[PDB]
Amino acid sequence: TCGLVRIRLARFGRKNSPVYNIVVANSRKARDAKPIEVLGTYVPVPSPVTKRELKRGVVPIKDVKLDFDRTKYWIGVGAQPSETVTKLLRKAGILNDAWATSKNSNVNRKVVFERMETLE
Amino acid sequence: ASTGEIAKAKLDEFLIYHKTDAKLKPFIYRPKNAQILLTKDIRDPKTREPLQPRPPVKPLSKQTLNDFIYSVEPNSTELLDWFKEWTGTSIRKRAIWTYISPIHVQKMLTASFFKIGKYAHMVGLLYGIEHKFLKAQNPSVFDIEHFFNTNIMCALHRNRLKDYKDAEIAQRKLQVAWKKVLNRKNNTGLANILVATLGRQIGFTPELTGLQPVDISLPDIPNSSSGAELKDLLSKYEGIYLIARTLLDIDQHNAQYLELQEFIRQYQNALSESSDPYDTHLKALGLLETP
Amino acid sequence: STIPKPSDQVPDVDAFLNKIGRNCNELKDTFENNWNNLFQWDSKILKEKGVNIQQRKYILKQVHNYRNNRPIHEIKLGKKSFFGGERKRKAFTAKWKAENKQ
Amino acid sequence: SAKAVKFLKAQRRKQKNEAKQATLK
RNA sequence: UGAUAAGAUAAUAAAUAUGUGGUGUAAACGUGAGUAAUUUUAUUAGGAAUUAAUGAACUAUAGAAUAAGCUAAAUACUUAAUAUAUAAAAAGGAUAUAUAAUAUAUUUAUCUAUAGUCAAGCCAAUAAUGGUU
RNA sequence: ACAUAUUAUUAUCUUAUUAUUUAUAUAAUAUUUUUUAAUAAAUUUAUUAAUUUAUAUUUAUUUAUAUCAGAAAU
Numbered sequence A: 001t002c003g004l005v006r007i008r009l010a011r012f013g014r015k016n017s018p019v020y021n022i023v024v025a026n027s028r029k030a031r032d033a034k035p036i037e038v039l040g041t042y043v044p045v046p047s048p049v050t051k052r053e054l055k056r057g058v059v060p061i062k063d064v065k066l067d068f069d070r071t072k073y074w075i076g077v078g079a080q081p082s083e084t085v086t087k088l089l090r091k092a093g094i095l096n097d098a099w100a101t102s103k104n105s106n107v108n109r110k111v112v113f114e115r116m117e118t119l120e
Numbered sequence B: 001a002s003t004g005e006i007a008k009a010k011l012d013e014f015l016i017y018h019k020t021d022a023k024l025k026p027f028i029y030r031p032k033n034a035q036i037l038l039t040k041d042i043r044d045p046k047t048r049e050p051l052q053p054r055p056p057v058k059p060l061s062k063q064t065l066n067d068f069i070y071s072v073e074p075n076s077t078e079l080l081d082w083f084k085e086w087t088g089t090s091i092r093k094r095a096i097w098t099y100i101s102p103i104h105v106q107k108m109l110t111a112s113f114f115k116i117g118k119y120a121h122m123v124g125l126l127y128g129i130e131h132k133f134l135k136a137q138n139p140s141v142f143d144i145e146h147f148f149n150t151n152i153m154c155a156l157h158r159n160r161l162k163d164y165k166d167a168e169i170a171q172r173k174l175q176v177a178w179k180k181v182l183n184r185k186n187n188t189g190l191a192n193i194l195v196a197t198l199g200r201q202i203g204f205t206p207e208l209t210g211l212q213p214v215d216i217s218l219p220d221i222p223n224s225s226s227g228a229e230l231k232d233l234l235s236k237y238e239g240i241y242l243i244a245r246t247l248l249d250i251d252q253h254n255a256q257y258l259e260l261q262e263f264i265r266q267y268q269n270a271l272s273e274s275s276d277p278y279d280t281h282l283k284a285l286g287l288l289e290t291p
Numbered sequence C: 001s002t003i004p005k006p007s008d009q010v011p012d013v014d015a016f017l018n019k020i021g022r023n024c025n026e027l028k029d030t031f032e033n034n035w036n037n038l039f040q041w042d043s044k045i046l047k048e049k050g051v052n053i054q055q056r057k058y059i060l061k062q063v064h065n066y067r068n069n070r071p072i073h074e075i076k077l078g079k080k081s082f083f084g085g086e087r088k089r090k091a092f093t094a095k096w097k098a099e100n101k102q
Numbered sequence D: 001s002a003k004a005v006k007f008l009k010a011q012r013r014k015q016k017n018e019a020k021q022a023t024l025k
Numbered sequence E: 001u002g003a004u005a006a007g008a009u010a011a012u013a014a015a016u017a018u019g020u021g022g023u024g025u026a027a028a029c030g031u032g033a034g035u036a037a038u039u040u041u042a043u044u045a046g047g048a049a050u051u052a053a054u055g056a057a058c059u060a061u062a063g064a065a066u067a068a069g070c071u072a073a074a075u076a077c078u079u080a081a082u083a084u085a086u087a088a089a090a091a092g093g094a095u096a097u098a099u100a101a102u103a104u105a106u107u108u109a110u111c112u113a114u115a116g117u118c119a120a121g122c123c124a125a126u127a128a129u130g131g132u133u
Numbered sequence F: 001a002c003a004u005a006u007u008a009u010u011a012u013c014u015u016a017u018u019a020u021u022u023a024u025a026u027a028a029u030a031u032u033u034u035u036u037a038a039u040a041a042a043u044u045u046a047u048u049a050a051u052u053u054a055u056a057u058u059u060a061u062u063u064a065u066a067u068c069a070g071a072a073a074u
């Protein structure tokens, strides 16, 4: 990632139980220093599904909280997301396939579920 | 001591001057700065003693390289080593890349074949380095009166001395030679005669594009007998004397042309008192063949 | 994933272990020139077979490259300058210019 | 000295003001 | 190519970071010596001088990228040319294709301008330990 | 009393370095400038080394001021 303003994960939580803040930060500041803004949170550990749920067809869910509007503003002013944040934003539908790379380009992989925007 | 040794020192001083760094040139060659040089104590490359003042260098005479060329031993790499060092200079040093004249290449090719006996490796250094001459804004050196004619002349002697008779190798080599000419200005017209003689000798019909027919225009040295003016004039026209004598001796068809014999009469009688250039060369080719 | 097919440059596992380099030719006996073993064994199996941390990760990276038609040529690990690392270069150079050129 | 000439210039200025205070008072 | 093999040229595949270059180390990390405040901290819906032809490095848009010298050579450095009172610049490389070194195309860099983003300088008001032996 | 250590100060002494400011050079380099040899090419021109000329940029020495520090005094 390049630039002075980057969107990246700052690590919180405890040893062996990482949680992350999605933050807009100056490139030169420490990973866990108070950033410019905290856009959201990322919990990397998927929620465990029960034996019955698994056969029932439930897929484990990773939970991300994100300010969609504020994130778009920072992309608009040229903030540069990290690779992991890029994957999150492409899955959220904020970023598109123009931000994909040659190593992760899923040009030929079947879609089992299409991105669905709902209200809850 | 010898003319060759003295010439080489002059030629090596000229190169060292022009290869010296521009910032350091005023302090190593202007004698008024000898004490400024000492104080600075610049260390000679190769971790040698600090550099010492040198005598100022003045423009070198083109005759200096002609003396060195004809001093090289009968079987030596000295001419081939000097040329490789001289033409390895940067193309930004104009003095080095403009000293070489069409006469020098003719005298480097005629000496190599008849005296030094390393013609093949002298025609490869010239063919290999022709591109650098073009980048160094000195293409004239590769002309038809000094480069092409001399080459075809040495071919008309090697093809005989060695008996080469292939009609494919000859044509391919002749085509390359013409392709290596950058200043195509046929004046004497001897080139067409030389090319035709090669074809008869090796049984092929020459055909080169741009070698338009030119009538003979041999320069006639006057009957007036001067000193250094006629010694230079003869040496000036020495190359075309080696080409006229060669043309007649190799093939008797060239005897038809009477212009060739007039020049022989004029050039030979001009200083018949001295030795013969053509004969002197022929002897050495035999003295080199025997080895 | 799936088993790629042997090529002409990389006919067998031994050729694969020689092209990647990094002293990976010393594992030719672990794989036994079995093409499928190279493309089925994951890190857990390689760790049980005595492959050290650095080599097994390197092999798995080159196995993924081969599976995706990407070059597997050896890329060398970085090395410090001849005159030493930046933090010790001034001292080293000073002691190397007083013992070589004086 | 330059520092001894600056000191005296300032000393005279301070003494003129101390006198000025007495003339004003 | 070189009439005998020393070299040159091009293509291909490797090597070199003990040669010249570029970028990176004003950060982060550690510590609490100094520092009682013309300087440091904290606070305010504070302020002007009414803060640079500063972009540091990304975003959007537009344009440009010229000639010599110096070094072995260059995206090194130097001097010039032309570009918002006007001032002030630059750089090529890789890969293809067509030509006879040049041109396009792709890709990655260089410079300038405008705005944004990030980020700077300065000032005020209020508060910040003990001793007047 | 005092012998010590530490720090600060200066109308004092010495002072690295640097900044600024003086004067000087038959100082160096580039260009200009006046001539002069040597050399080279061509049949005047170029180059190099000198001299004259101003200009810019440096260098050496030098004048003055400030300055790390040390000395002395307090």
Ligand SMILES: [K+]
Residues within 6 Å of the ligand: E030
């Ligand atoms: K610590």
Ligand SMILES: [K+]
Residues within 6 Å of the ligand: E032
């Ligand atoms: K402290």
Ligand SMILES: [K+]
Residues within 6 Å of the ligand: none
């Ligand atoms: K380009």
Ligand SMILES: [Mg+2]
Residues within 6 Å of the ligand: A001, A002
């Ligand atoms: Mg990058």
Ligand SMILES: [Mg+2]
Residues within 6 Å of the ligand: E017
């Ligand atoms: Mg290097």
Ligand SMILES: [Mg+2]
Residues within 6 Å of the ligand: none
């Ligand atoms: Mg710091």
Ligand SMILES: [Mg+2]
Residues within 6 Å of the ligand: none
């Ligand atoms: Mg250019």
Ligand SMILES: [Mg+2]
Residues within 6 Å of the ligand: none
């Ligand atoms: Mg250039």
Ligand SMILES: [Mg+2]
Residues within 6 Å of the ligand: none
């Ligand atoms: Mg540059």
Ligand SMILES: [Mg+2]
Residues within 6 Å of the ligand: none
């Ligand atoms: Mg400039």
Ligand SMILES: [Mg+2]
Residues within 6 Å of the ligand: none
């Ligand atoms: Mg301008």
Ligand SMILES: [Mg+2]
Residues within 6 Å of the ligand: E133
């Ligand atoms: Mg008391």
Ligand SMILES: [Mg+2]
Residues within 6 Å of the ligand: none
């Ligand atoms: Mg002083």
Ligand SMILES: [Mg+2]
Residues within 6 Å of the ligand: none
């Ligand atoms: Mg002091």
